[PDB]
Design an enzyme around this catalytic site. Structure first.
Site, mmCIF file in Angstrom:
data_model
loop_
_atom_site.group_PDB
_atom_site.id
_atom_site.type_symbol
_atom_site.label_atom_id
_atom_site.label_comp_id
_atom_site.label_asym_id
_atom_site.label_seq_id
_atom_site.Cartn_x
_atom_site.Cartn_y
_atom_site.Cartn_z
ATOM 1 C CG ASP A 403 -2.186 -0.901 1.039
ATOM 2 O OD1 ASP A 403 -2.426 -1.510 -0.032
ATOM 3 O OD2 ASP A 403 -2.930 -1.025 2.025
ATOM 4 C CB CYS A 437 -3.408 1.975 -11.772
ATOM 5 S SG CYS A 437 -4.482 0.840 -12.713
ATOM 6 C CB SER A 438 -2.218 5.681 -8.736
ATOM 7 O OG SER A 438 -2.050 6.686 -7.754
ATOM 8 C CB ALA A 439 -1.415 10.441 -10.208
ATOM 9 N N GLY A 440 -0.521 7.898 -12.353
ATOM 10 C CA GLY A 440 0.245 7.465 -13.520
ATOM 11 C C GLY A 440 1.663 8.046 -13.595
ATOM 12 C CB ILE A 441 3.757 10.370 -12.129
ATOM 13 C CG1 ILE A 441 3.233 10.680 -10.724
ATOM 14 C CG2 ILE A 441 3.045 11.181 -13.209
ATOM 15 C CD1 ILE A 441 3.110 12.160 -10.427
ATOM 16 N N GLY A 442 4.172 7.438 -10.430
ATOM 17 C CA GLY A 442 5.142 6.823 -9.458
ATOM 18 C C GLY A 442 5.514 5.367 -9.756
ATOM 19 N NE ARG A 443 1.630 1.546 -6.040
ATOM 20 C CZ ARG A 443 0.574 1.014 -5.432
ATOM 21 N NH1 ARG A 443 -0.182 0.125 -6.063
ATOM 22 N NH2 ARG A 443 0.281 1.376 -4.191
ATOM 23 C CD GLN A 484 5.754 11.471 -7.669
ATOM 24 O OE1 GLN A 484 5.244 12.075 -6.734
ATOM 25 N NE2 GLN A 484 6.236 12.105 -8.725
#
Ligand SMILES: Clc1ccc(-c2cc[nH]n2)cc1
Length: 511
Positions: A403, A437-443, A484
């Site tokens: 998470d 998925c999410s904002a599309g920058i970290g993972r 990130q």
């Protein structure tokens, strides 16, 4: 520039600085000493200082009582061109007017701190080229610094004498820096900037052009283990040096900022650059603006990628328009639909064996297969009214990412990416791999950068050159904030190491 970030300052030092060298509206940003992914925005107003926390667990920068951002520099630009926008817990307005500049040079690519003159010569002799430079501490004169510069003909090879290294003493006298005459500067950074613009000339004509710092991050992939051992005792300093270069990447995002496009964005200030955004054709004539999705093409610089956000309810049709138009045959999904009780990616695919229409696009879920770390869904995509358009799209849904943070072992990520790679390569003329998925920058950035680095080693084997921060910078120039956190940065190094290590076991097992 990015002089308002102070990498090595305590809360008490931040307050002192604003109170004695700032005014109302002065601000700075600093990292937390103990808890990484935590940052603080310190701001003077009404003759006092307030501290505003910023959190990052891997998806975005979350400013308390403000918005979510792709980079610290995008956060600062937003509030410097938008007054009264940042509010205290009380409800009052907090103005960011005047950056409070940092003198500390430890995050600049050209600063080598600890070096000697002959060591610097051998470095520049071996890795450097015309206009390559560094700044280092003096050994004869304690307190002073030295600027060292290669010049001459790059065309040449062999030790012909057509190039040379020049050393320029830099004195430090009561907090100011100078080259022995002329202007006294408040920081080494100010001095370097000035002589970068206005190069020193010698009595006899040579111009000491400062064209680029010396590269110290490129390694032979087989030496990965040595670099990782060394960075482990480090990863933070290298990461923060990379972060200093994010001020060069504030490209325009106007199409995302348009009224018509506002509720197509998961977060209102995390937006695609104009120059790399995915442009959608063939839309509904009635719809005012049918050409926008929060997505960028990522080109390494033959496999390309589309980095995008998790769908909203009102962008599922646009997502399938994109997959169809770009001829994409593989989708990577890096979040559960729900984590910590909040929606992270809306379900945009049908249940197993079911069939659904999404606007003019039809999708059948043919079969799901469950693996330890992921589920694979075999989807068939076609345009309604036109049978001959059907193609298989394979959806790889990574389900076990933690998470917060990153996995403590990379094996599951690497097996996953190896399977994604072989599928993509099995399909003649497949378009770019979609990653989201999410904002599309970290993972999303972490999975793409790992894939790029592994593909080099797939081609050129275990002896070949890789350069982690340089790759991340090139990908960050095509979508804001790709990768990130420090922990994702470390994780990338560890994944490459694991890959190299298994690859050497083929040779061991053979003999
Ligand atoms: Cl393009 C680029 C950006 C940053 C670095 C670097 C050097 C030390 N840390 N980061 C290297 C290349």
């Amino acid at each position: 520039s990015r002089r308002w970030f102070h990498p090595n300052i305590t809360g008490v030092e931040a307050e002192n600085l604003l109170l004695t060298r700032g005014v109302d509206g002065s601000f700075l940003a600093r990292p937390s000493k103990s808890n990484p992914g935590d940052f603080t925005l310190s701001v003077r107003r009404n003759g006092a200082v307030t501290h505003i926390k910023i959190q990052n667990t891997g998806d975005y920068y979350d400013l308390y009582g403000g918005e979510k951002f792709a980079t610290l520099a995008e956060l600062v630009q937003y509030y410097m061109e938008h007054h009264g926008q940042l509010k205290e817990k009380n409800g009052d307005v907090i103005e960011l007017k005047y950056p409070l500049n940092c003198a500390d040079p430890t995050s600049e690519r050209w600063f080598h701190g600890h070096l000697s003159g002959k060591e610097a010569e051998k470095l520049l002799t071996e890795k450097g080229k015309h206009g390559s430079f560094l700044v280092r501490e003096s050994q004869s004169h304690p307190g002073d610094f030295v600027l060292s510069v290669r010049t001459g003909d790059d065309k040449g090879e062999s030790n012909d004498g057509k190039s040379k290294v020049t050393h320029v003493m830099i004195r430090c006298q009561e907090l100011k820096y100078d080259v022995g005459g002329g202007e006294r500067f408040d920081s080494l950074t100010d001095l370097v900037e000035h002589y970068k613009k206005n190069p020193m000339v010698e009595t006899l004509g040579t111009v000491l052009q400062l064209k680029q710092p010396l590269n110290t991050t490129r390694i032979n992939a087989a030496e990965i283990e040595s670099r990782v051992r060394e960075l482990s005792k480090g990863f933070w300093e290298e990461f923060e040096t990379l972060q200093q270069q994010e001020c060069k990447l504030l490209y325009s995002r106007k199409e995302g900022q348009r009224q018509e496009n506002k509720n197509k964005n998961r977060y209102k200030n995390i937006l695609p650059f104009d120059h790399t955004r995915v442009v959608l054709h063939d839309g509904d004539p009635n719809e005012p603006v049918s050409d926008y999705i929060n997505a960028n093409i990522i080109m390494p610089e033959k496999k390309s990628y589309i980095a995008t956000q998790g769908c909203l309810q009102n962008t599922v049709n646009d997502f399938w328009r994109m997959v169809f138009q770009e001829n994409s045959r593989v989708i990577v999904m890096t979040t559960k639909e729900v984590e910590r009780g909040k929606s992270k990616c809306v379900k945009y695919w049908p249940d197993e064996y079911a069939l659904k229409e999404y606007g003019v696009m039809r999708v059948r879920n043919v079969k799901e297969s469950a693996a330890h770390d992921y589920t694979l869904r075999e989807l068939k995509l076609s345009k309604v009214g036109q049978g001959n358009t059907e193609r298989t799209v394979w959806q790889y849904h990574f389900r076990t990412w933690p998470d917060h943070g990153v996995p403590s072992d990379p094996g599951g990520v690497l097996d996953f990416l190896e399977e994604v790679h072989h599928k993509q390569e099995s399909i003649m003329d497949a378009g770019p791999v979609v990653v989201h998925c999410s904002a599309g920058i970290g993972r999303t950035g972490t999975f793409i950068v790992i894939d790029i680095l592994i593909d080099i080693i797939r081609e050129k084997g275990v002896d070949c050159d890789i350069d982690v921060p340089k790759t991340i910078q090139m990908v960050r120039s095509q979508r804001s904030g790709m990768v990130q956190t420090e922990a994702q940065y470390r994780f990338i190094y560890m994944a490459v190491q694991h890959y190299i290590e298994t690859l050497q076991r083929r040779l061991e097992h053979h003999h």
